[PDB]
Amino acid sequence: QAQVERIMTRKELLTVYSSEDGSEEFETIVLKALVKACGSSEASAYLDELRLAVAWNRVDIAQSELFRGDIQWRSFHLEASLMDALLNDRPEFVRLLISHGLSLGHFLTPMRLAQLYSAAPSNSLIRNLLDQAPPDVGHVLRMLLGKM
Amino acid sequence: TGVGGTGIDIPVLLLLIDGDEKMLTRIENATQAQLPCLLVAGSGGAADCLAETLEDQGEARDRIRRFFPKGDLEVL
Amino acid sequence: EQSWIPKIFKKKTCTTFIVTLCQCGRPRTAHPAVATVWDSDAHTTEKPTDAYGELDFTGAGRKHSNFLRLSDRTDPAAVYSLVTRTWGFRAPNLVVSVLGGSGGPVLQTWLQDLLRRGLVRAAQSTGAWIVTGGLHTGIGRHVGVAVRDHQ
Ligand SMILES: [Ca+2]
């Protein structure tokens, strides 16, 4: 009984798993536990939770807690997360990241754009066109449209 | 709104977006003047703190949502 | 018709000295020879206004921007009468005053969008006035640019 009371004294860390009739989905639960287990907002220790949220599709969780306004998100902080979201096709997440004070003009770089284009999926049509043709994107557009 | 008293009162309100302790004092003066004020959540210090207080530890929030200086000051 | 602007409104001068460097920031070298804690009005001398007139910003602009310099301790009634009658600004159907330091010349994209969309659209529909710090930085600059865009 004393052990149970001691556990309750620090219930901020414990989190139950809702089966929800074979839910088999708890990434949101992990994120919720991680956020509720931090408390202090310094904007330098919350990057890992943000990266995890990007790796998953828990945009709602990140918005509710990570971008609830309590934390002071900087500009350079979100560069890597935005790049990851772009590479993995996270539309809602990229919209959220850009929404919260991210300067695209200072972000996009020739190297960044080259990587984005190199993210073409395996032997995709765009990949074939790029190989046939630095991003080297003007030539492909001129070939397609006609350059006239 | 013109025509002397034949017109009608012109509405007014103040929009708050972040701030500091001086901004909080400004808000207090305005409220004591009986002028509506609107706060935006997530703006930053002096604005999100009041929003949280309205939504609702208080001392911890005062220190958290605002920089360390003046946080210990119970005048806040 | 501006022969009376100095008559009603006034300018404030440091006059007395309150300490190299003083509270008012004027260098000790440049200070009135007439001279504990600086006084907002007691240590101040009232003089007729001298910076009234209209502004025509170099380059792009509307070639008309009524700018008036007035003492801090001025009754708002006279200012309102002046604006309403002399300058021809019709009585607003609404007045919104924006507040907040908004640290950082560049503001949050979400905050900028919220401001420029919501507040300015409301003003456009109702035809209101907006009062902000007349400074080309931060929130004031954002309000100015959004208002110009909607105009
Ligand atoms: Ca962490």
* Nearest alpha-carbon partner for A83 in A59, A111, A45: A111
Distance CA C39, CA C14 (A): 9
Q: What is the 3-state secondary structure (H, E, C) of A77-144?
A: HHHHHHHHHHHCCCHHHHHHHHHCCCCHHHHCCHHHHHHHHHCCCCCCHHHHHHHHCCCCCHHHHHHH
- Resolution of the coordinates, Å: 3.2
Place of tokens 């989190």: A15
**Size of chain B, expressed as the number of residues it contains:** 76
**Facing residues of C53 across strands?**
C67
Domain housing A109: 46-133
Distance CA A68, CA A93 (A): 14
- Cβ–Cβ below 8 Å for B14 and C97: yes
DSSP codes, A18-33: --TTT----HHHHHHH
Cβ-based neighbour number of residue A28 at 10 Å: 15
C82 Cβ neighbours under 8 A, 6+ residues apart = C68
Collect all residues of chain A within an 8 Å Cβ-Cβ radius of residue B43. 69
Distance CA B70, CA B19 (A): 14
Give me A141's structure tokens.
Answer: 């557009």
User: Is C111 in CB contact (< 8 Å) with chain B?
Assistant: yes
Angle between helices B48-55 and B58-65 (to 10 degrees): 160
B57 Cβ neighbours under 8 A, 6+ residues apart = none
Distance CA B71, CA B76 (A): 7
User: Is the distance from CB of B76 to CB of B27 less than 8 angstroms?
Assistant: no
User: Is the distance from CB of A87 to CB of A119 less than 8 angstroms?
Assistant: yes
**Residue B54 in 3-state DSSP?**
helix
Give me B45's structure tokens.
Answer: 């210090």
Place of tokens 């950082």: C104
In angstroms, what separates the C-alpha of A103 from chain C's closest C-alpha? 8
In angstroms, what separates the C-alpha of A68 from chain B's closest C-alpha? 7
Q: Which amino acid is at C18?
A: I
User: Is the distance from CB of B76 to CB of B20 less than 8 angstroms?
Assistant: no
Give me B64's structure tokens.
Answer: 């958290």
Residue C44 half-sphere exposure toward CB, CA atoms < 13 A: 15
Distance CA C46, CA C31 (A): 16
Residues of A with CB under 8 A from a CB of C: 98-103
Which residue of chain C is at minimal alpha-carbon distance from A101? C108
User: Residue A48, annotated ligand binder?
Assistant: yes
DSSP codes, C17-38: ----B-TT--BSSSS-TT----
Q: How far is the CA of A41 from the centre of ligand 1 (A)?
A: 10
Distance CA C48, CA C10 (A): 4
**Facing residues of C96 across strands?**
B13, C130
Cβ-based neighbour number of residue A82 at 10 Å: 22
User: Is B41 in CB contact (< 8 Å) with chain A?
Assistant: yes
Residue B42: its H or E element: none
User: Is the distance from CB of C81 to CB of C88 less than 8 angstroms?
Assistant: no
Interface of C with B in 55-84 (CB under 8 A): 84
User: Residue A45, annotated ligand binder?
Assistant: yes
Strand-pair category, B37-39 with C10-13: unpaired
Q: Is C93 left (phi over 0), alpha (psi -120 to 50) or beta?
A: alpha
Phi, psi of C49 (to 5 degrees): -65, 145
Distance CA B16, CA B39 (A): 5
| Radius of gyration of chain B measured on its C-alpha atoms | 16
* Nearest alpha-carbon partner for C90 in C50, C51, C126, C54: C126
- Cβ–Cβ below 8 Å for A69 and B64: no
Angle between helices A91-99 and A79-87 (to 10 degrees): 160
In angstroms, what separates the C-alpha of C112 from chain A's closest C-alpha? 9
Distance CA A137, CA A123 (A): 17
Helix, strand, coil shares, percent, chain B, to 5: 40, 10, 50
- Cβ–Cβ below 8 Å for B64 and A72: no
Distance CA C33, CA C145 (A): 45
**Residue A7 in 3-state DSSP?**
helix
Distance CA B52, CA B59 (A): 12
| Radius of gyration of chain A measured on its C-alpha atoms | 21
Give me C54's structure tokens.
Answer: 């209209």
Give me A136's structure tokens.
Answer: 């080297």
**Facing residues of C10 across strands?**
C48
Phi, psi of B13 (to 5 degrees): -160, 165
